[PDB]
Write a protein that binds this ligand. Structure first.
Ligand SMILES: Nc1ncnc2c1ncn2[C@@H]1O[C@H](COP(=O)(O)OP(=O)(O)OP(=O)(O)O)[C@@H](O)[C@H]1O
Ligand SMILES: Nc1ncnc2c1ncn2[C@@H]1O[C@H](COP(=O)(O)OP(=O)(O)OP(=O)(O)O)[C@@H](O)[C@H]1O
Ligand SMILES: Nc1ncnc2c1ncn2[C@@H]1O[C@H](COP(=O)(O)OP(=O)(O)OP(=O)(O)O)[C@@H](O)[C@H]1O
Ligand SMILES: Nc1ncnc2c1ncn2[C@@H]1O[C@H](COP(=O)(O)OP(=O)(O)OP(=O)(O)O)[C@@H](O)[C@H]1O
Ligand SMILES: Nc1ncnc2c1ncn2[C@@H]1O[C@H](COP(=O)(O)OP(=O)(O)O)[C@@H](O)[C@H]1O
Ligand SMILES: Nc1ncnc2c1ncn2[C@@H]1O[C@H](COP(=O)(O)OP(=O)(O)O)[C@@H](O)[C@H]1O
Ligand SMILES: [Mg+2]
Ligand SMILES: [Mg+2]
Ligand SMILES: [Mg+2]
Ligand SMILES: [Mg+2]
Lengths: 258, 283, 323, 323, 323, 323
């Protein structure tokens, strides 16, 4: 037995990315770097559950037609891994290319690092009140599993209903041409080395609206996903005075105005 | 069903070289150069559909993964190998530099030798930004193209929309793009027969040999491919002649990669060739 | 036929860690590194006698337990005889060994197969080849055997303690393997002349005639055999106050430590130490005797180590608690 | 027929540690390192002649002790008799031998099985192979061996002296195996023409006629052989006075020798040397002759400093005792 | 279909070296070296067609002389006759070959057996090093190949011209393999604009139709492998004057080459060349035509000045000879 | 079928050692280093057909000795028969021989056993791996083999001369193996033009016809066999008086030589030389001719100094010999 998806607290970057990937798998995969203790492998296994013939998870070549695939070892991979990711999003086995990375040791190669389309980072909690909450939850889980999940059972049905309703809202796009020109302009303003970025963000932010249930796409929607998919492609130079995400925010502000 | 070879926005450098190598099997391949993206792989797979031992069906494109050995490459036993599939087809090599072996040398040697006869094309790619190939092994390739990322808002949105369109309805689009594709196929079929009729003046041969000799280019490989490429281009334009202008359009990208590597200063690659061409010609 | 446990002179810190870990297997193992001599394993191999007893289903090569389906083997899960008194088994692997014995060979029983609910001892862990050491990282932290190859599949629970020793002036395992071991303790050399004379005389005396000497120490050691079973009974009665947890999670968070890996063990180590003493409540003193031992190899900082890690932990503890 | 022992000219220091090890088969081993030549490898192979007898049961590859019911290896423990006296054996392993015969694979007896309680000689231990050296790293100084190659996992007694030679120009020993040996003796070439003439003449004479050369020394060899047996029975009578045991321990403190192993071996050898002379009361100037050659290779020091590693031990000896 | 030899334009030096090596198959081969292009690997392939015929025994795994020697090689010695009068073959080895394949294993012949008394072509000799270059250091210059691998033990005759090429900007060879080569012919690319057009036209004409090209050159080329054969019969009739031989060694000693192999080669090459041109005598001109490109290969490396190769040899030859 | 040994032009010093190593086959060996060419590997190979005869036991592969001490292997020693008077042999191992055909395993007779009381020619000894040179290190200078690799436990009586060649422009020998060689000789290229003319003519004439050359150089060779047979029996008659044996060792003491093996060889080589010129009394000029090449390499190089080895040895001779 594993935690339900509504057990992780505070840290929420991966949730948005994984839920966006689940609704539409055309984006690709997600690359996450973080420590070996903060709980990267625990939260993902939760997402394996509560996933909506009569249909109702793979860990590292044929049984991948439905369901995500977790690698756990791609970071130290030297080569070949390119073959599996190319073959995945090439029709003749659609699945989510969720992956695990570490800030040190293997960092992959810029030739491959631009085949994924999503990237989020992990930061420390730095909160005594929250850490004791997590410790208490883990302890009461360890005391006995079965009664713990039943307590959090009610919200899982609501989450499933929301995901199912949002999945079938594909025609809701209403994406404005002027905003498409503006996003292409801001992306092309910095060095991106290809057209991989523009296609990913155009089909990502729109889908976020489908999560909420609205129809139109405004600046607020894009602002929350613009950094998350156009940061690791910004490998300008090792002279990193500040994190590239802040540079993305700077160019975002200088163009739209905020 | 795949993307047609007419909707690729811009990038006339790759298309011209690919067409020339298609209409002239003995040129010796291309080494498309550039950074990531910009449709290196889409164009190659878009070329295969646009196509109609010693003595016929539809052509097939053959590719191999980066991780391979002689178990599949050789195709040892009457088992036919991977190369024994393109008797009238094409073969693709990716990240050539990442393949540290003599297998790449074997493939180059198998070219221009129809004895198992294969007679395919040898498009090369990779090396976005990870060290140039060996100065010897790079000298057995016909022409060296180049790809650069488009820098403009008007096109950058359009291409994206175009791609999105192909995911709205992958079928029901070829008929919309049918008339453009058929025009190119008929033209290339016609041009494949007019080639053995071009005449090159002896006087221009002296001038082109002088142009080659003025540069400190080693060997004679720079004067066995240009003569064929100019004839192929002139035949492609549907004529039986050659002027000084046609050679100019297939000389910069045919001999650029044979130049001296020495970084004495920052002379541009094509600028030196253009300067020499202007110096020894009346253009 | 070996050196009795209650004959070691000095080296108190290692004994405390070993007994604390053997009280409750939810520890994560113990790491021992230090100079030659000083009886690194002279003590570890002496733990065969000082062990409790557990019930095991009869004629079970996998050493399963009554019920406990979560960790119940195949022959009791899908098929479902009486249990009997049995001893906790300690097994060790040599530095030079093949890979056939460690894993399965096809079902044959592997080295880990006859290691459940026991203690795994490795000697000179810094000299083992990387081929074998990459298999233990699979069975550990997963609690399940993996070998199912050769066309026929087989599953097997696997859980041990994995305590080991080594030498610090040759290498330190892998950067990631250090996090598998929950506890880490080091030994120095006692330089008091009287203690050295005492240990030399003790070793010489035992070297004369084994059976007469060991029996002399019988009255004391047996008492320990009837003092460690008390901790395993009073353990599920200790309680922690919110003021204690809010500080055990504050001291760790103040230092640049990996998230929720150091706080969990320190919350389960001191809480068990009282059971060894015999009380039912935890005081501030009990924190001081386990805080240094637990948060040592998690402390990742700059390569410069002019200060002492134990000194840093003690001073931050004093500053936070005001002691 | 090999060179007789009591004919080697000079080299008094090296010609005593071997006898000390022969008298008491528990101290450890003697590793001899010196310049090329000097006959390091001719004394060791000639030691087989001067050799006492020990009792060992009949029809047993392990050569177990008929008494001491705690040392029975495999089946005579279950059976718990043709007791016979026998000469102890000498077995040397070649440098170009694999691990098949060193440990044992099939249960056939390995090379280590054939050298129980005897003498194991290694030639040019400086090189070996850095891979086979690991299996014997822990088998010695433990008294037990375990083999698990295929289908057999049995505990195997193993004890020997592990004498070895070397050359200090092809590398240095690993700082872990260096502590298994007991004493370290250095060799310096002779520098007097008369002795060189003597050794050349004696070698030529032996090469002239092997058999008639032995009779010129046989009574001396018999006389030496009688002395070893007598000193092998009077050993458990000597006794170290308590003040001396405290005094010797303080020497190990000042030199900062890591590990409490130098103290044990230094004490053990002092008793044996006294039994060789015939007395039964150790005294100062009797351990003075056995300390400088036992606290030299265990002395970690500054990379360069300025000591031959020989003056410091005697300086501390003089400071402590006073001579 | 291959490019006819007589159609190759230019390169009047390397053609001479190859032709002089074919007529007298004992000089020691050539080591053609130069920049890219210029057809270094075209002529070698072309020379296969223009080759003579030699007698050989049948059923023999490797070529051998029918009855000229006493056949001290293998069972042909005491078994002593089918002769097929076959043609000498061309054998080449790849850069990725392995040592066992070159010699043999459990008796399967290797590459050496095939390339005996023949032209063994080595591709890019500069890159190959260490492995599979030490075994070749005894098969040549001795005539006998010794194989003592995997128990199999025989003796193998072997001698070959060993024609090898390579690039001049990828390092230089070690001296041991450098002196096994007879001559050393350097290639320089044509630079006159009036000449390259001819090469381009000839290549284009050949590529248009490989047939109807040999007939355009068949009468001319068939007049080449008639002068060579006739030159072979005349060769064992030349008589170099004694006076010249004195002066030839003077150049060698004055230039201070290393060894003595630099004087046996020159005489044989001069005799073969003077037999090629038709006469049955030797003049000064014949020496000057081949001494330039024989000794230069063996000069001493010197980076202290800017003196090229061949220039010094010509200067010394002019100074010591007539004019 | 091979080049005659007595027709070698010049190089007297190389001819001296290869004869002294056959008259009394108890010296360590020889080592000759020099430039390319100059026939280092031609003189050595010509020695095969000029050797004496010794008795052998039946057809044993180990080449035992019937009328000799207890050195007749182990299987023959059970007896203590037919006599054949065979001729000694020389066996050479290649540059890439596998471990199977050096120590021997299966009992398949190894290469060392088949080269007992013979000569082992190690060509190009400058290029040999760190392996295959240790298994050769113990068999020499000890005269007993020990193979314990694959289930076989056999001790072989092995003894050879260990003749090796090579050139010094590719590395330096290891310190241990550099001492097993007996005497070291140097080769320098000839410079007189007339000698070069003679040597070229000789080689060309020999190559012209393999036979009908022994028919010329027969009488000058058959006299050498009876020149060595007589000298092989007068050796155990010559005695060096005690006056000079004291002096020779002094020389070594002055040169700071390492070991006492560099002094035994000279006292034996000097006795061998005087038995070759007919005399039966060693005097000066019979040890002066051999002390130069038997002590040249057993000397500390000390690259700080800039004095050649040859001059230093002769400089100190007159210091104590008054010349
Ligand atoms: N209480 C003690 N303190 C120190 N040394 C002791 C003590 N009791 C025994 N010894 C001795 O210390 C030595 C160390 O024993 P052990 O076999 O464990 O070696 P070690 O050096 O600790 O282990 P390793 O060689 O694996 O590092 C032995 O000689 C042992 O008799
Ligand atoms: N007292 C002595 N000191 C030195 N050498 C002696 C002495 N007595 C005899 N010798 C002779 O000196 C020689 C030394 O060679 P030996 O085989 O003993 O060396 P080793 O110990 O194997 O040397 P290495 O250190 O090179 O392995 C032998 O010929 C031996 O007979
Ligand atoms: N006389 C000639 N001189 C130079 N090139 C010639 C001559 N005759 C023909 N050629 C042509 O010149 C070209 C040189 O290419 P080729 O393959 O022979 O080069 P190469 O010397 O073998 O090169 P590499 O060093 O790369 O192996 C070929 O097309 C060959 O047909
Ligand atoms: N006495 C001699 N001195 C020098 N050279 C001689 C002598 N007798 C013959 N030669 C000839 O000199 C040449 C030397 O070549 P050889 O093969 O003997 O050299 P090497 O010493 O074996 O060389 P390497 O060091 O390459 O093994 C041969 O042609 C040989 O016939
Ligand atoms: N919400 C949470 N916040 C903090 N820590 C958590 C949380 N959930 C689980 N953990 C802890 O994190 C552990 C998993 O750490 P994780 O980083 O996934 O390991 P790894 O990176 O080695 O796979 C869990 O076993 C638990 O102790
Ligand atoms: N006309 C076009 N010009 C440039 N790029 C294009 C065009 N059409 C599609 N693409 C892009 O090319 C990408 C795939 O090719 P590419 O990434 O270049 O392959 P590779 O990375 O192997 O070179 C697609 O993601 C697509 O967005
Ligand atoms: Mg230990
Ligand atoms: Mg020795
Ligand atoms: Mg070539
Ligand atoms: Mg030779």
């Amino acid at each position: 037995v594993v935690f339900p998806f509504t057990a992780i607290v505070g840290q929420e970057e991966m949730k948005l990315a994984l839920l966006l990937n689940v609704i539409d798998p055309k984006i690709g995969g997600v690359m996450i770097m973080g420590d070996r203790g903060t709980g990267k492998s625990t939260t993902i296994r939760a997402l394996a559950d509560l996933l909506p013939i009569e249909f109702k998870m793979v860990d590292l070549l044929a049984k991948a037609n439905r369901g995500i695939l977790y690698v756990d070892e791609v970071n130290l991979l030297d080569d070949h891994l390119v073959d599996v990711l190319l073959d995945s999003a090439a029709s003749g086995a659609r699945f989510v290319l969720v992956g695990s990375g570490n800030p040190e040791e293997g960092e992959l190669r810029p030739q491959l690092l631009d085949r994924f389309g999503m990237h989020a980072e992990i930061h420390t909690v730095k909160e005594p009140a929250l850490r004791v909450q997590i410790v208490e939850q883990r302890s009461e889980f360890d005391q006995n599993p079965p009664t713990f999940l039943e307590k959090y059972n009610p919200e899982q049905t609501a989450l499933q209903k929301k995901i199912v309703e949002a999945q079938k809202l594909l025609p809701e796009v209403k994406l404005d041409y002027d905003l498409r020109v503006k996003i292409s302009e801001v992306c092309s303003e910095l060095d991106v080395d290809g057209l991989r970025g523009d296609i990913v963000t155009n089909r990502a932010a729109k889908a976020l609206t489908a999560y909420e249930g609205r129809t139109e796409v405004t600046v607020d929607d894009i602002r929350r996903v613009i950094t998350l998919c156009l940061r690791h492609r910004l490998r300008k130079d090792p002279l990193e005075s500040i994190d590239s995400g802040y540079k993305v925010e700077k160019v975002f502000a200088r163009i739209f105005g905020v």
